[PDB]
Design a protein around this ligand. Structure first.
Ligand code: A1IWU
Ligand code: A1IWU
Lengths: 134, 134
């Protein structure tokens, strides 16, 4: 019943049930937690991963309404470092290695799952069904 | 500092920042509240209002992750009645009259605002900008 600090980062563009379940899972890794959520910057996301619909301000403002989210770092650093974990006193990083090998060697890696098919892009397809024909 | 029970209902299809701000506003109408959120059924919504993308189960499961939501009635009745307020001991109904005249006569109506332009349908337009040309 000591409080465990969990860090989860991501883009969190067009937040959907998949993101929410993953956040829920991080929050509940232990009985008593503080879930810190990192939100990646627009430039770094675009340069290193892919396009983003929503600004950093929009993606962060949305996460503020999520029950599981206790603290937000926005923008977060694109790569997690041992110094960053010390600075914010982070006990574990939650993510669904090569990059993460050092986190697992330190015992600070907690896996979470993805929920496929519940995404924002998947919803528009359902709207189209009422039409897609000849 | 006595606890005030607030009821807000709606479709909550493809939940977005607009819905979240409105829920936040209901939750914070008084210092100490229980926010009950009613989620309208698929059939009644379709018959009386318009199309819906997500099932009742999907719309309800999403609201479960929202910080401001304390209790959910799913499905909720399509029309609020004085008997329903008694049954769930509801002090105020929060909504953004003809229909609601009786609620205001009873002192049980609290207005909230809408946030236009932050909707799910408005996000797809931004994606299209990268293309819309000749
Ligand atoms: N969603 C991918 C990703 C990339 C970098 C980072 N720091 N976090 C997440
Ligand atoms: N969103 C409109 C609406 C219709 C009926 C009801 N009970 N609540 C909301």
């Amino acid at each position: 019943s000591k409080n465990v600090v969990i860090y989860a980062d991501g883009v969190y563009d067009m937040l959907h049930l998949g993101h929410m379940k993953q956040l829920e899972q991080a929050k509940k890794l232990f009985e008593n937690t503080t879930l810190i959520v990192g939100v990646t910057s627009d430039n770094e996301t675009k340069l290193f991963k892919g396009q983003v619909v929503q600004t950093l301000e929009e993606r962060t403002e949305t996460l503020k309404h999520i029950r599981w989210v206790d603290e937000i770092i926005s923008p977060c650093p694109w790569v997690v470092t041992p110094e960053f974990l010390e600075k914010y006193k982070i006990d574990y990083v939650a993510h669904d290695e090569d990059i993460y090998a050092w986190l697992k060697r330190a015992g600070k890696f907690k896996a979470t799952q993805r929920t496929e098919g519940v995404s924002t892009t998947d919803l528009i397809v359902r709207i189209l069904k009422n039409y897609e024909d000849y």
